[PDB]
Design an enzyme around this catalytic site. Structure first.
Site, PDB file in Angstrom:
ATOM      1  N   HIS A   1      14.943   1.701  26.761  1.00 57.09           N
ATOM      2  CA  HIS A   1      14.051   2.143  25.688  1.00 57.09           C
ATOM      3  C   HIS A   1      13.318   0.988  24.991  1.00 57.09           C
ATOM      4  O   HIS A   1      12.469   1.260  24.147  1.00 57.09           O
ATOM      5  CB  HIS A   1      14.724   3.070  24.677  1.00 57.09           C
ATOM      6  CG  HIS A   1      15.708   2.414  23.766  1.00 57.09           C
ATOM      7  ND1 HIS A   1      17.067   2.551  23.965  1.00 57.09           N
ATOM      8  CD2 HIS A   1      15.499   1.717  22.627  1.00 57.09           C
ATOM      9  CE1 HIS A   1      17.645   1.918  22.954  1.00 57.09           C
ATOM     10  NE2 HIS A   1      16.739   1.399  22.122  1.00 57.09           N
TER      11      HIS A   1
ATOM     12  N   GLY B   1      18.141  -2.529  15.238  1.00 59.10           N
ATOM     13  CA  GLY B   1      18.095  -3.860  15.846  1.00 59.10           C
ATOM     14  C   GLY B   1      19.357  -4.232  16.624  1.00 59.10           C
ATOM     15  O   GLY B   1      19.384  -5.252  17.326  1.00 59.10           O
TER      16      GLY B   1
ATOM     17  N   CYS C   1      20.670  -2.437  19.149  1.00 58.75           N
ATOM     18  CA  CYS C   1      20.645  -1.961  20.539  1.00 58.75           C
ATOM     19  C   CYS C   1      20.744  -3.109  21.535  1.00 58.75           C
ATOM     20  O   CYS C   1      20.203  -4.190  21.278  1.00 58.75           O
ATOM     21  CB  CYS C   1      19.430  -1.086  20.815  1.00 58.75           C
ATOM     22  SG  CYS C   1      19.304   0.358  19.734  1.00 58.75           S
TER      23      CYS C   1
HETATM   24  C1  LIG Z   1      19.391   7.099  13.628  1.00 55.71           C
HETATM   25  N1  LIG Z   1      18.288   6.884  14.547  1.00 55.71           N
HETATM   26  C2  LIG Z   1      17.054   7.303  14.288  1.00 55.71           C
HETATM   27  O1  LIG Z   1      16.770   7.908  13.256  1.00 55.71           O
HETATM   28  C3  LIG Z   1      15.985   7.003  15.329  1.00 55.71           C
HETATM   29  N2  LIG Z   1      16.473   6.580  16.633  1.00 55.71           N
HETATM   30  C4  LIG Z   1      16.184   5.192  16.996  1.00 55.71           C
HETATM   31  C5  LIG Z   1      17.218   4.662  18.025  1.00 55.71           C
HETATM   32  C6  LIG Z   1      16.948   3.186  18.406  1.00 55.71           C
HETATM   33  C7  LIG Z   1      17.694   2.402  17.330  1.00 55.71           C
HETATM   34  N3  LIG Z   1      18.799   3.299  16.951  1.00 55.71           N
HETATM   35  C8  LIG Z   1      19.916   2.849  16.173  1.00 55.71           C
HETATM   36  C9  LIG Z   1      21.075   2.350  16.756  1.00 55.71           C
HETATM   37  N4  LIG Z   1      22.179   1.975  16.094  1.00 55.71           N
HETATM   38  C10 LIG Z   1      22.161   2.074  14.773  1.00 55.71           C
HETATM   39  C11 LIG Z   1      21.057   2.557  14.028  1.00 55.71           C
HETATM   40  C12 LIG Z   1      21.070   2.681  12.617  1.00 55.71           C
HETATM   41  C13 LIG Z   1      19.989   3.178  11.951  1.00 55.71           C
HETATM   42  C14 LIG Z   1      18.863   3.563  12.658  1.00 55.71           C
HETATM   43 CL1  LIG Z   1      17.503   4.213  11.783  1.00 55.71          CL
HETATM   44  C15 LIG Z   1      18.785   3.466  14.020  1.00 55.71           C
HETATM   45  C16 LIG Z   1      19.894   2.959  14.747  1.00 55.71           C
HETATM   46  C17 LIG Z   1      18.592   4.584  17.353  1.00 55.71           C
HETATM   47  O2  LIG Z   1      19.352   5.513  17.169  1.00 55.71           O
HETATM   48  C18 LIG Z   1      17.216   5.635  19.203  1.00 55.71           C
HETATM   49  C19 LIG Z   1      17.534   5.204  20.492  1.00 55.71           C
HETATM   50  C20 LIG Z   1      17.676   6.143  21.499  1.00 55.71           C
HETATM   51 CL2  LIG Z   1      18.187   5.616  23.079  1.00 55.71          CL
HETATM   52  C21 LIG Z   1      17.463   7.486  21.277  1.00 55.71           C
HETATM   53  C22 LIG Z   1      17.105   7.914  20.012  1.00 55.71           C
HETATM   54  C23 LIG Z   1      17.000   7.003  18.960  1.00 55.71           C
HETATM   55  C24 LIG Z   1      16.747   7.514  17.594  1.00 55.71           C
HETATM   56  O3  LIG Z   1      16.800   8.704  17.335  1.00 55.71           O
END
Ligand SMILES: CNC(=O)CN1C[C@]2(CCN(c3cncc4ccc(Cl)cc34)C2=O)c2cc(Cl)ccc2C1=O
Ligand SMILES: CNC(=O)CN1C[C@]2(CCN(c3cncc4ccc(Cl)cc34)C2=O)c2cc(Cl)ccc2C1=O
Ligand SMILES: [Cl-]
Lengths: 305, 305
Positions: B41, B143, B145
């Site tokens: 991603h 950040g 990931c």
């Molecule tokens: C909570 N996430 C979101 O609101 C947006 N979100 C972005 C994302 C990439 C970054 N990330 C995060 C990874 N760990 C901790 C996070 C803490 C706070 C946030 Cl806002 C993001 C985090 C995701 O979950 C993501 C990656 C993938 Cl493969 C599939 C979906 C998403 C996704 O939905």
């Protein structure tokens, strides 16, 4: 999101761990530049531990009585001196892996990472705090002496603890890297006991602010308290007194969440009275006190949920 | 004495972490030999995350669109390919710090260390377990990931997890190093949720054996039970079924303490039916399930790496 007991990455410290042997005693040493730091009791037998005269035991030693092993290489000891409860062994090779470092003496309530080692080899890393009674609730077996505690804020390693002993209650005692013990302990097998321990109040408050930042407010109430009334109540639960310094230190977390420190103190007073009623705070059914205000700011998001 | 949530020393993994940037998306990569592994991603913008066609997004990229930074040095990308949900970036420099390693897929109940990274720089290390619902209760911010999970066995690092996302309940999801997700998750911003979780029974039993080894025996009783009768109790409290394999795996801890596994199951049944009555076990008021039988043996024996 999430809140874990997080240790600093240990790589900078792993590259400094060595094995130190003097006769039949073997423990861990910290190799920084051309000096190996280790507990002075490496020169003692079990018999010497009741009333050791370290100056008398040390004068009978030469440089070649100390065997220092770094990985599979033998380092040559070219000098030795004692500084308080630490033995400093001058070696003929400076550690090429020496990180940027400082020696810092910490106060009770402060947290640090421990790299537990056996025979100069790292086995694990965990987070812990200097208790108010100057002991640490570590996880150490025989052979772990010389293992160190540290913080790595920015790229500089601040060494704050060196492991020397385990007390009868299973808790641990040691020194700063200048060999001064934390608390009223001595590197002697004498009747020694940890004093009555108390809960680190400023840390519990910091962890309650971490819970609010992560999205939980069930424990808040409509009340406030004076600092003195909070201390009268808290002392009854074996909690450390909260000082104006602690209130000042909690300022940033208070502004990020909009909850005054004395209002969070009122919430802590109620939690002490009521318990959690089947609920948890950040996955814990106990009030956690091994996260400082600084640790919460380091780990938590700057944006409250 | 003492029992801490202990992570493996992280140094061998710290020397593999890099920063990967593609357009406006920046995350972490794992540099092993001449390949950088990172979540696919990274090729997506916020808009693409809604419904991405990864092959179509990838075909529009050249090697120079990927910026890989190792410390203060820029690595040159000379090739790229996708394997499941992981992007493999061929670089022109083999990592001189590449440790002996394997890619392994773990099962629910298994624990591992996580080296949380931001911008290719390690910030912390913590221990966690793969939940029965295939999520992990980690501590990750935006950040993070590309941060990885691993275990160490002698000198070999077994990489088992790469971080991809956070679910609405604040728990985390990711893949093995071959890009196969743990759990029924997909790498896109769609309605996704963690399933109902259960407690890892064999791990709770292992932690009860750790408490006995450490002198906490108040919960032991004269009773025993059958595997069938214990499983009927476990199902009622959302505990994972205990199998004969789990009973066999607990054999060594059973012999070290003299408490039969079904004897410890009778203690766990009583704790499940009555609670702790104001008491704690290893400083916890909850039954801890993130220590495997192997973790307990390793921490109570001082195994080094
Ligand atoms: C909570 N996430 C979101 O609101 C947006 N979100 C972005 C994302 C990439 C970054 N990330 C995060 C990874 N760990 C901790 C996070 C803490 C706070 C946030 Cl806002 C993001 C985090 C995701 O979950 C993501 C990656 C993938 Cl493969 C599939 C979906 C998403 C996704 O939905
Ligand atoms: C529990 N201690 C003992 O029975 C004997 N004992 C040896 C020793 C040196 C090694 N060590 C240990 C250090 N950490 C974890 C230990 C875990 C289990 C054991 Cl048995 C020992 C451990 C000590 O405590 C020691 C050093 C100093 Cl400076 C002052 C006193 C002592 C001492 O009393
Ligand atoms: Cl301090």
């Amino acid at each position: 999101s999430g809140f874990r007991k997080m240790a600093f990455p240990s790589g900078k410290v792993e590259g400094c761990m060595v094995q130190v042997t003097c006769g039949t005693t073997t423990l861990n040493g910290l190799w920084l530049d051309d000096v190996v730091y280790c507990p002075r009791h490496v020169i003692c037998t079990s018999e010497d531990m009741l009333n050791p005269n370290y100056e008398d035991l040390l004068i009978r030693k030469s440089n070649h009585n100390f065997l220092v092993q770094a990985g599979n290489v033998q380092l040559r000891v070219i000098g030795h001196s004692m500084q308080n409860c630490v033995l400093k062994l001058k070696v003929d090779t400076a550690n090429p892996k020496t990180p940027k470092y400082k020696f810092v003496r910490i106060q009770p309530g402060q947290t640090f990472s421990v790299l537990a080692c056996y025979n100069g080899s790292p086995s694990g890393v965990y987070q812990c705090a200097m208790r108010p009674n100057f002991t640490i609730k570590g996880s150490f077996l025989n052979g772990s002496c010389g293992s160190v505690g540290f913080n790595i804020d920015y790229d500089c390693v601040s060494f704050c603890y060196m492991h020397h002993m385990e007390l009868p209650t299973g808790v641990h005692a040691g020194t700063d890297l200048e060999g001064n013990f934390y608390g009223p302990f001595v590197d002697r097998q004498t009747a020694q006991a940890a004093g009555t321990d108390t809960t680190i109040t400023v840390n519990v408050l910091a962890w309650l602010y971490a819970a609010v930042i992560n999205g939980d407010r069930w424990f808040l109430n409509r009340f406030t308290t004076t600092l003195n009334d909070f201390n009268l109540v808290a002392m009854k639960y074996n909690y450390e007194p909260l000082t104006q310094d602690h209130v000042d230190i909690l300022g940033p977390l208070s502004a990020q969440t909009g909850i005054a420190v004395l209002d969070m103190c009122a919430s802590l007073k109620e939690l002490l009275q009521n318990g959690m009623n089947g609920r948890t705070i950040l996955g814990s059914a106990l009030l956690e006190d091994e996260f400082t205000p600084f640790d919460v700011v380091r780990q938590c998001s700057g944006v409250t949920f």
